[model samples]
Target: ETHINLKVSDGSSEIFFKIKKTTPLRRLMEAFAKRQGKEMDSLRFLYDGIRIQADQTPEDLDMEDNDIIETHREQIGGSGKAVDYDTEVLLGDGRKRKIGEIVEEAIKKAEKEGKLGRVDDGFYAPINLELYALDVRTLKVRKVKADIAWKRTTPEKMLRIRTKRGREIRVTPTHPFFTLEEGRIKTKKAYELKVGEKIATPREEAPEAEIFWDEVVEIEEYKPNNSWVYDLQVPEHHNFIANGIFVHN
Candidate 1:
């Protein structure tokens, strides 16, 4: 029987599992939840940047060996549905406000409730507003739209938004980032990456609590047509064991 390796994470530590390609995704998720001592139904899985369904097959989803899968323990009851600052807002009239306006409204409401606090500019909310802009020469969104009509029309517009975790991806045309790999230092086209792959920039190092990349970090919406891009910073590092990939020093 053929086998495939999958990396599973619960937004903290990661675990790897190898199983037959013919197996249902539910089995894999069950094993993960069991090891974590959590209820299987309380955990949600995401593969290739999309939520995984119980009936999906590896072949049907075009899953390859060594793919990454993310798992999140679902929060239960009213607390789960509680509205927070980062909760997304959708208008019933089919119109959406800009980020600033949305943030302002949240501040006003919070103030009325006596829960207003120091909100950072780094805070961000996800929205489904349609954007408009110029299409670069090598754009593929149009082609993707043609192939699948319901992909939410692609736009050339840019949004300088921040993540709720206080990070900015700067959705743009030509952004470059780093990913940790098991092999030699290599360069590849950003667009070639599949969803859920691990990417990180090394930071400070020490005997105590050496900092590593965040478990849930990734580069999304990468386009190679524009010149502008951002590089995640490696603030500090003295030396570390380099894998057997070799070094020219």
Candidate 2:
């Protein structure tokens, strides 16, 4: 009951074998090559070729009765990992490129320049991620660098606060907002602030932009999964624009 007839074939010819379900392929491999006057190195044995490990049994791959294992020309090189190399990635120089092409170019350059780096042994930590942040001094939304960018799981609820000026933002309840009250500015959490409180924004008509106030028209609690929320630590400046509203870090 554990035995089956498996067929190995090229387009022009076929050979059949009676093999047990749990039988290993090493001896069968050598037998096939010699009996057929074929060079084993120049051949490829394929199945559900996910990650073709030779030291596996027919049972491991669910090889069935009369299952056809095809042979094809051996390929020289390939990256077997699952990745979308064609995915676009942003670079520091403000250019976009296919991440796959960028990595291939990187590999070539490093190999010619002598392939290696000090941080080669572990997952890379991206230290200088960039975002558009409010520069209070410049009064402009400048592309700035964040020394630390991080994400955390939000418990159950977050806030979607809308302003009277049509500006809106979604953030964690604990996220800080720059509130203007009694003609003085202060940082208060989203949940801590109520409707009618004013938040700071930038005047677009100014040649260099200027700080302006927008009123908090509505604030509501909404559910989120244990889903991710993000925050950043930009150097010196502690604020960023969230959907056109100036918010505190």
Candidate 3:
């Protein structure tokens, strides 16, 4: 459980990332992008006017449990200039009061521009690096019935039904609901998995790789590792190609 609270503002919009505890900043970063409904590549993070170093844990920077990280981003309908971006992000225990005040002020300013509108329908924090249940198990799906929790609680919020109709949907986790499990990938993760479901490298590896499961559609005795296999299936009449594999599996 990684508890971290992020107060973000792009001068027009403001949002917070309320996570569990000790959540890595990398995961939080991705979560922020997803919650903002922005592509990961479209966003970059800066701390104290310098690009934050990569591959480092937020704990290394002395981020405490539920520590509030306050910052702002470039706003829309503007020239996207980095003006007035000289903000201090003091990460320490004694600085909590001062940081909170600064964050509150920033939020007030952004709300005036409709950036931080009413809180979105769902909100969450990063429990770990993996959110949206997007481990290899969830990625290997051509047709899947995904189970996602609501952060702000909404009923009409539904999955795009078209996504289940054999279309490729690259969904990233915005809230804290996913945890990437290491070691043995037990069978329980695949209980809801169906045929034509699969996980693959972020990069297209094969045009014909189908990570689908096969069965007589029968339910037999349960045993560990007594599970089905997934192949990356491609449509016929197209030869698969082994492209660059960039997934950090």
Candidate 4:
């Protein structure tokens, strides 16, 4: 048969999926999340140690009929969600300003515009707000709209990643931070970060596109007193500068 049977597991339970070899796995992910009533972004789909992307098909990975795709809750740190620091934000115009304000702006713009796709209590098609982001692919920082900024349902312990020169940002353990791996900018989870590792940071030069590396000096985990911690949805690059440091969203 050209179709293959696949399995998805959350470490506790498993769900089986059957799909044609040429079909994009994204559809499978949608089916999986909808049944769980999940919003998709927080539900993780992994091909064990090898990361399977939504755009890849079973044939792309040479999967067998019984290949297992692991599922994860993503907790409070999927698609980059945690921390609420009023740190300096660089606007597309290079203005330093700021998320409730940011979130409201998105909602209002959606209300005023769009073809009116559909409406639900929690669901509204999102809009993007332009902000400076690091494009490690080109070794330059550029502007990308942060399409979504969401609140976490429950508080979890957050890690304060402090750098050599006092630049710091608090994030969840599973939150991804930009670090050097194999001489390229790659993501390492907040908890996975250790002292002496270099993380990407912005240079002091007036040209904001420049990036520099800084050593992680310490990492401390602490419970959040506030109930709602926020995360950003920076599509393409999936990263943003938090308090002047590079982190994945």
Q: TM-score of each candidate? A: 0.35, 0.47, 0.26, 0.59
Per-residue lDDT of model 1, residues 10-111, tens digit only = 646488988777888888888888887877877767785577988776777777877888676543321110111222222223232332344445445654
Model 1: clashing residue pairs? none
lDDT of 3 by residue, 33-84 (tens): 6777875434545443344444545556655543444333322322211101
Flag regions of model 1 displaced more than 4 Å: 77-249
As a whole number from 0 to 100, the lDDT of residue 121 in candidate 1 is 10
Error of 1 at 147 (Å): 37
Q: Which stretches of candidate 3 lie over 4 Å from their true place?
A: 20-22, 64-249
User: How would you encode candidate 2's per-residue C-alpha lDDT over 1-249 as one tens digit per residue?
Assistant: 888777866434578888887777765655665665766654556674342445777888887878876554332221111112332333334444543354444444544575322111111112355545567566565666655433333335667788898877777676777776786667887778889888877565222466777888999887755223444455777875545666666
TM-score for predicted model 3 compared with the true structure? 0.26
* lDDT sort, best first: 4, 2, 1, 3
Q: What's the lDDT for all of these models?
A: 0.38, 0.57, 0.29, 0.68
Off by over 4 Å in 4: 1-80, 85-87, 104-125, 205-208
- Clash counts for the predictions, in order: 0, 0, 25, 2
Residue 240 Cα positional deviation in candidate 4, in Å, after optimal superposition: 1.8
Better of 1 and 2 by lDDT: 2
Model 4 Cα lDDT, one tens digit per residue, 81-152 = 455545455566666554444544555676578622221112123756677778757768877778665544
